[PDB]
Design a protein around this ligand. Structure first.
Ligand SMILES: C=C(c1ccccc1)[C@@]12CC[C@@H](O)[C@@H]1CC(CCCCCCCCCC(=O)O)=C2c1ccccc1
Lengths: 240, 10
């Protein structure tokens, strides 16, 4: 594989997935083990704790990128507030592409779960969102979506051109153009059989964003109705 | 947004 130098630098920012998976699994096990039989976290409550912990990993990933670090905290907050849910969904989708089997759901804790089991515990909204995500998983697997392209899409999601009120919007513009050019060069060069792959990759970002917008609004209102157990970071991202 | 600000400063 011929990898643009920029993409190699982007990959250095990826967390140690095996270690992240273990740490979140121990946290969720200590959570259930620290309460009795009557107050055990519901499946929904566990997913909230899971997403909450994933958000910590996302924040630490962003702050590990040099480009992100050149921005002041106000700018960093504005970028992360605009895309945290999209990053969560994109991460979940990629996880199904890699460690995924059709009919199953692979979680950030490394647990493999049957799709129909989880789906039957969700309402109409999350069922529709989960099913739409699975359709994206299938489309991306057929395109041979790989880790190099994944990291590129993550940076394109983080450094969005639609975030307003930034001090250093120029840095955000420059990152978007650089990653776009690197991703195009990488995809066209490593997947010549899948022509228009690059265009099909970018066409999926608006779908992933739409899914994550609905998911965020659902959680926000579930929290207002008191259905969301306390998850500091997740709650705080919603209450903004 | 206090906790996110702390995470990015820590
Ligand atoms: C958006 C998240 C989330 C966060 C909290 C609760 C739920 C979801 C994620 C994204 C990555 C993970 O951290 C989450 C798990 C995953 C699948 C959710 C299935 C659980 C539904 C049963 C409880 C339903 C009860 C109800 O209906 O209220 C999520 C996901 C993945 C793809 C599309 C949409 C959501």
């Amino acid at each position: 594989a011929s990898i643009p130098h920029l993409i190699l630098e982007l990959l250095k920012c990826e967390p140690d997935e095996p270690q992240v998976q273990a740490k979140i699994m121990a946290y969720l096990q200590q959570e259930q083990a620290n309460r009795s039989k009557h107050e055990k976290l519901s499946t929904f409550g566990l997913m909230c704790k899971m997403a909450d912990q994933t958000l910590f990993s996302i924040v630490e990933w962003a702050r590990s990128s040099i480009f992100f670090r050149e921005l002041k905290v106000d700018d960093q907050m504005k970028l992360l507030q605009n895309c945290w849910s999209e990053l969560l969904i994109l991460d979940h989708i990629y996880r199904q592409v890699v460690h995924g089997k059709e009919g199953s759901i692979f979680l950030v804790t490394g647990q493999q779960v049957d799709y129909s089991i989880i789906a039957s515990q969700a309402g109409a909204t999350l069922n529709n969102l989960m099913s739409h995500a699975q359709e994206l998983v299938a489309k991306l697997r057929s395109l041979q979506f790989d880790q190099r392209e994944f990291v590129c899409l993550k940076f394109l999601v983080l450094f969005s051109l639609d975030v307003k009120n930034l001090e250093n919007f120029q840095l955000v513009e420059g990152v978007q153009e650089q990653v776009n050019a690197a991703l195009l060069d990488y995809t066209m060069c490593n997947y010549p059989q899948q022509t228009e792959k690059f265009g099909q990759l970018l066409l999926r970002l608006p779908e992933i964003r739409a899914i994550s917008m609905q998911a965020e609004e659902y959680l926000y209102y579930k929290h207002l109705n008191g259905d969301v157990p306390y998850n500091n970071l997740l709650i705080e991202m919603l209450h903004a | 947004n206090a906790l996110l600000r702390y995470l990015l400063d820590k």
